[PDB]
Design a binder for these strands. Structure first.
Lengths: 186, 149, 213, 82, 129, 82
RNA sequence: UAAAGUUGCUGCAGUUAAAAAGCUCGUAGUUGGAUCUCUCUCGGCCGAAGCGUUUACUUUGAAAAAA
C-alpha cells in the first residue's frame, strides 16, 4: 500500500500499490513487504516514446527495500512491460536559512537535509545495484555543468541499458544533467 | 610538516572513495557495536579498538558499517574515558620523561623533549577546553600528572 | 602515414630494421624520447617502437618533399658513420650535403665561404651535430634528426627514433628516408623494390676497404 | 586591430605558435614555419598541398618542438593513431 | 600551512600557462575557485574545466588555452566601493581595453564591468588578463 | 610534457604514484580471506595488520606484523577480496 | 613638498653591496583547508506588529555653516 504525507491519493500510486499488493499475495517475498511501505510513485517520459517509473520510499525502510530491490524491480518490469523502475527514497530538502524568514526552522538544518546531500543520496539510490566509484563535474564553455558518474563494472550489464533512463530520472527530479559511464579501474 | 620537528613526512591512511560496508563483511551494525563494547570493557582505546577490528574482523571502517565513530559509540553507551585518548597519551609520555629526568639530571635533551611534550599537552588541553570536553578549571601540573595516568 | 595503406610499413622494411639493429637503442633514455620506446630489455637496452619510427620517417619525408627546391634541404653528418649515407642521400634526392666538420658560422656568417641559407636541416645525430642545430636556432631553420634513446631533442623539430650508433642502422635510415622522399615526389614507384639497396649508404672501416682490395 | 569605425589600424597581424598560441615575435629567429606535404590517399604521392605549423623558439629550446609537431600532425590526420 | 586556496589555484594556473601546458591540476577546489574559473571562462581566457570529486575536497583539471597573460589574487580581500574601482583598474589592469578585476559582491562573483553594471561594490578577489 | 592528459591517467602510471598523489586517492592495502588446513573456518586479515592474528579454530599464528605488509604463515591460503 | 620605489600600503631591500635573531619553545598579536540552494491577526485582489541570530561588507536614503 502507499501512504502519502500530504494526505492526497493518486491513481498511478493506487496502481503501484495494487501491484505491490499482488506481489504480497503470491511470491517468495510476501514476508518482506508486509511491513515495508512506499510514499509515492510517478511516471515520466525518458525519451522518444519510452517511460520510467519512480517509487518513493521512507528512509528507514530503504535499506530493507534494498535487500530485495532487484527482485522487485524485475517483477514490476515484467508486470509493467517496457517501463523501467527505480527506487529513490523520499528525501526532504530544507531551505538554506536566509536573513529574512520566520518560525519554521528553530533548529539548525542537518546536513543530510541539505540540497547537496539529498541530491548525492538520490544519485546513489537511483543506480542502487551498481555502486558509485567516481564523479566528475565538467563545466562547459557556457557555464553549464555535466555530471559524469563512473559505475562499478562488476554489475554493468544489469544497468547499462538503464542509462539514458537514470539520466532522465535525475534530470526530472533533480534538474541536473548527469552522464553515466564505466571506467577501467574502480 | 611536524609540529615540533623539522620533518615533512607524508605517510598516512588513504581512505577509499566508497563509503559503503565491504562485500566480504557480514557483520551487522549491532554486532560491530557489541564487539566495540567488549573491546572497550577489555580496556582498549578507540585507536586500538579500530586497529583490531580492521586487522582481525575485516571491519575496514567502523563509521561505514555503524554510521558512527568509535569514540562517539563509546560515549553513547557511556564507557568513554574521562579525558581524551591523545591527551592521556601525551600526559603519560610527559610523566615518563619527568620520571626519567629525576634520575638523569644531566640529560638536557630530555628537558628539551619534555618542554616540547608539555607544549603539545597545553595546546591539546586548550583545544579541548574550548570544545568543553575538559572542564574549564582543568590544568596540567607537574605533580598531579602521574595521578591522571 | 595517416592510415593510408599505401604508406603502411612492409614486412621487408621490418626485416631490414631488425637486421640493421634499428630497433635497438641505448641504455639511457632522454625523457623526451619516452614516447618512442616500447620497453626496456632484461639487459638495460631500450627497444624502439618501429611503428613510431616509420611514422616519424614518413613525417620527415613529407616535410622534405614540401620544399620544391631540393638543394634548399641541407643534410649534415659529422661522424664518419653517416658521411657516405648523407652523400648518397644528397645525390639521390638533390639535397646539399655537409659531410665532415661543420664550420661554425656557415648559417650565420654571411661573409664566410661556405655560407648557405637552407630551408630545412637534417642531421644524423643531434649530439654529434649540435653545432648546425644551434645555428638552426638563428635563421628560422626547421630541423630533422635521427635520434637515439638518449638523444637530446633541443632544436629538433622532427625526431626520427632510431639507432644512430651503428653504421648499418644509420645507412639504412638514410636510405629509407631517401626512398620515401622519392616515392612521395613521384620518381620511383611504390610497387617494386627500389633498385638501390641500403649497403650503398653504409660506412666501411678503412680496414674493410683494404680487405675488399 | 579595429578602431571604433571598424577599419583595421595594425601594421600587421603577427602569427601565433601552433603549439602554445603565444605570439611569435618579429625578432624570434629560433621560430620555424614548417610545411608538411599532403599525400593522395590512393597513390601515396605529393598532391601539391601541405599543412603549415609555426613553432616559436621557446618550445624548440625546451625540446618540445618534436612532441608539438607530432601532435599537430596527428590531429591533422598526417600521423596514424597510436 | 596552506591559506587562500584561491591564491594557490591562480598561482598554479599562472605557472602552467608560463610553461605552455594545455592543462593544469588545481587542488583543493572550492566554490570561490569554481566561480573565479567560470568568470575566467565566460571571457574566453581558460576554456572548459572538469571537477574531479574525491570524497574530501575537489580537484579541478583546467584545460589551458594560451590566451592568459597573468591571473593573480589580491590578498587581503580588500573591500572595494564603486568609486575605488577605477583606481583598482588603473593599478591592476594592463589596459582599459581588456583585463578584468574579479570581485565578490552580494550579487555573486563577477568582473568589475559587471559590478559597475549591477551598481555594486564588494571585496576584490583577484584579476586576470 | 606540455600535453599530459591529467584527467585520464593510464592505470599503470596511476598505480605507480603514491597513494595520495593519485587523481583520486586509493589505498595500496587490501583484505584477504585466509584459511588454514588445520581450521574449519576462514578469517579476514588486513594486508598490513599490526597485531598477531590467531586461528579462529586453533591456537596458531596467522600473520606476523612487519614494517609494511604482514607476514602470513606458510601453508595458509590467502585470497584478496574486492 | 615632488623628485624619493633613498621609509616602499600601493611599492623597497636583507648569500656576497647596510642587513635573518646562535637555536628552538611559547602568550598576546597577525593569519587560518573543503563543505550547507519569510509565520498567528484586519475594515476581502491588500495592508503588516516582526525576530529571520547578529556583525563586517556593499548600495540607498536622511542629516550634515559658510568661506
Amino acid at each position: 500500500i502507499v501512504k502519502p504525507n500530504g494526505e492526497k491519493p493518486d491513481e498511478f500510486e493506487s496502481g503501484i500499490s495494487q501491484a505491490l499488493l499482488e506481489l504480497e499475495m503470491n511470491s517468495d517475498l510476501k514476508a518482506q513487504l508486509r511491513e515495508l511501505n512506499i510514499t509515492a510513485a510517478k511516471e515520466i517520459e525518458v525519451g522518444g516514446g519510452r517511460k520510467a517509473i519512480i517509487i518513493f520510499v521512507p528512509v528507514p525502510q530503504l535499506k530493507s527495500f534494498q535487500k530485495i530491490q532487484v527482485r522487485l524491480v524485475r517483477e514490476l518490469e515484467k508486470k509493467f512491460s517496457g517501463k523501467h523502475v527505480v527506487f529513490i527514497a523520499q528525501r526532504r530538502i530544507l531551505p538554506k536559512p536566509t536573513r529574512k524568514s520566520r518560525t519554521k526552522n528553530k533548529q539548525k538544518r542537518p546536513r543530510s537535509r541539505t540540497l547537496t546531500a539529498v541530491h548525492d543520496a538520490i544519485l546513489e539510490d537511483l543506480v542502487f545495484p551498481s555502486e558509485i566509484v567516481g564523479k566528475r563535474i565538467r563545466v562547459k564553455l557556457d557555464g553549464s555543468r555535466l555530471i559524469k558518474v563512473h559505475l562499478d563494472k562488476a554489475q554493468q550489464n544489469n544497468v547499462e541499458h538503464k542509462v539514458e533512463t537514470f539520466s532522465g530520472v535525475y534530470k526530472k527530479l533533480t534538474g541536473k544533467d548527469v552522464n553515466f559511464e564505466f571506467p577501467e579501474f574502480q | 610538516g611536524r609540529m615540533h620537528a623539522p620533518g615533512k613526512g607524508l605517510s598516512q591512511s588513504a581512505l577509499p572513495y566508497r563509503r559503503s560496508v565491504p562485500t566480504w563483511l557480514k557483520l551487522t551494525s549491532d554486532d560491530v557495536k557489541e564487539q566495540i563494547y567488549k573491546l572497550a570493557k577489555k580496556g582498549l582505546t578507540p585507536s586500538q579498538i579500530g586497529v583490531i577490528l580492521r586487522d582481525s574482523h575485516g571491519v575496514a571502517q567502523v563509521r561505514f558499517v555503524t554510521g558512527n565513530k568509535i569514540l562517539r559509540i563509546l560515549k553513547s553507551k557511556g564507557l568513554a574515558p574521562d579525558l581524551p585518548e591523545d591527551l592521556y597519551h601525551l600526559i603519560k609520555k610527559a610523566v615518563a620523561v619527568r620520571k626519567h629526568l629525576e634520575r638523569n639530571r644531566k640529560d638536557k635533551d630530555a628537558k628539551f623533549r619534555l618542554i616540547l611534550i608539555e607544549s603539545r599537552i597545553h595546546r591539546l588541553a586548550r583545544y579541548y577546553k574550548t570544545k568543553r570536553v575538559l572542564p574549564p578549571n582543568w590544568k596540567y601540573e607537574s605533580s598531579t600528572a602521574s595521578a591522571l595516568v | 602515414s595517416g592510415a593510408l595503406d599505401v604508406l603502411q610499413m612492409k614486412e621487408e622494411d621490418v626485416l631490414k630494421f631488425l637486421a640493421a639493429g634499428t630497433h635497438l637503442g641505448g641504455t639511457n633514455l632522454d625523457f623526451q624520447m619516452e614516447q618512442y620506446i616500447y620497453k626496456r630489455k632484461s639487459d638495460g637496452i631500450y627497444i624502439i617502437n618501429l611503428k613510431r619510427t616509420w611514422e616519424k620517417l614518413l613525417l620527415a619525408a613529407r616535410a622534405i618533399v614540401a620544399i620544391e627546391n631540393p638543394a634548399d634541404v641541407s643534410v649534415i653528418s659529422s661522424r664518419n658513420t653517416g658521411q657516405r649515407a648523407v652523400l648518397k642521400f644528397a645525390a639521390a634526392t638533390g639535397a646539399t650535403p655537409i659531410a665532415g666538420r661543420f664550420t661554425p658560422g656557415t648559417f650565420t656568417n654571411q661573409i664566410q665561404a661556405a655560407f648557405r641559407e637552407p630551408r630545412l636541416l637534417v642531421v644524423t645525430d643531434p649530439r654529434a651535430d649540435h653545432q648546425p642545430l644551434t645555428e638552426a636556432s638563428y635563421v628560422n631553420l626547421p630541423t630533422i634528426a635521427l635520434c637515439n634513446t638518449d638523444s637530446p631533442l633541443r632544436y629538433v623539430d622532427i625526431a626520427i627514433p632510431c639507432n644512430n650508433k651503428g653504421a648499418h642502422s644509420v645507412g639504412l635510415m638514410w636510405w629509407m628516408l631517401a626512398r620515401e622522399v622519392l616515392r612521395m615526389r613521384g620518381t620511383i614507384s611504390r610497387e617494386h623494390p627500389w633498385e638501390v639497396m641500403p649497403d650503398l649508404y653504409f660506412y666501411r672501416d678503412p680496414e674493410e676497404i683494404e680487405k675488399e682490395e | 586591430m579595429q578602431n571604433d569605425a571598424g577599419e583595421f589600424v595594425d601594421l600587421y597581424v603577427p602569427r601565433k605558435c601552433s603549439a602554445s598560441n603565444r605570439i611569435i615575435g618579429a625578432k624570434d629567429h629560433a621560430s620555424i614555419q614548417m610545411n608538411v606535404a599532403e599525400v593522395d590517399k590512393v597513390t601515396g604521392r605529393f598532391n601539391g598541398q601541405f599543412k603549415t605549423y609555426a613553432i616559436c623558439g621557446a618550445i624548440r629550446r625546451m625540446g618540445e618542438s618534436d612532441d608539438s609537431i607530432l601532435r599537430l600532425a596527428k590531429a591533422d590526420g598526417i600521423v596514424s593513431k597510436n | 600551512v596552506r591559506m587562500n586556496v584561491l591564491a594557490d589555484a591562480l598561482k598554479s594556473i599562472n605557472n602552467a600557462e608560463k610553461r605552455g601546458k594545455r592543462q593544469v591540476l588545481i587542488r583543493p577546489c572550492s566554490k570561490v575557485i569554481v566561480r573565479f574559473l567560470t568568470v575566467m571562462m565566460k571571457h574566453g581566457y581558460i576554456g572548459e574545466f572538469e571537477i574531479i570529486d574525491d570524497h574530501r575536497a575537489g580537484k579541478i583539471v583546467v584545460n589551458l588555452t594560451g590566451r592568459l597573460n597573468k591571473c593573480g589574487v589580491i590578498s587581503p580581500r580588500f573591500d572595494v566601493q564603486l568609486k575605488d574601482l577605477e583606481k583598482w583598474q588603473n593599478n591592476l589592469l594592463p589596459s582599459r581595453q581588456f583585463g578584468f578585476i574579479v570581485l565578490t559582491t552580494s550579487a555573486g562573483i563577477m568582473d568589475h564591468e559587471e559590478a559597475r553594471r549591477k551598481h555594486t561594490g564588494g571585496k576584490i578577489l583577484g584579476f586576470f588578463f | 610534457p606540455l600535453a599530459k592528459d591529467l584527467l585520464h591517467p593510464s592505470p599503470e602510471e596511476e598505480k605507480r604514484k603514491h597513494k595520495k598523489k593519485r587523481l583520486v586517492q586509493s589505498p595500496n592495502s587490501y583484505f584477504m580471506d585466509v584459511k588454514c588446513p588445520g581450521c574449519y573456518k576462514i578469517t579476514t586479515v588486513f594486508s598490513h595488520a599490526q597485531t598477531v592474528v590467531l586461528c579462529v579454530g586453533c591456537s596458531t599464528v596467522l600473520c606476523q606484523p612487519t614494517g609494511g605488509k604482514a607476514r602470513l604463515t606458510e601453508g595458509c591460503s590467502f585470497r584478496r577480496k574486492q
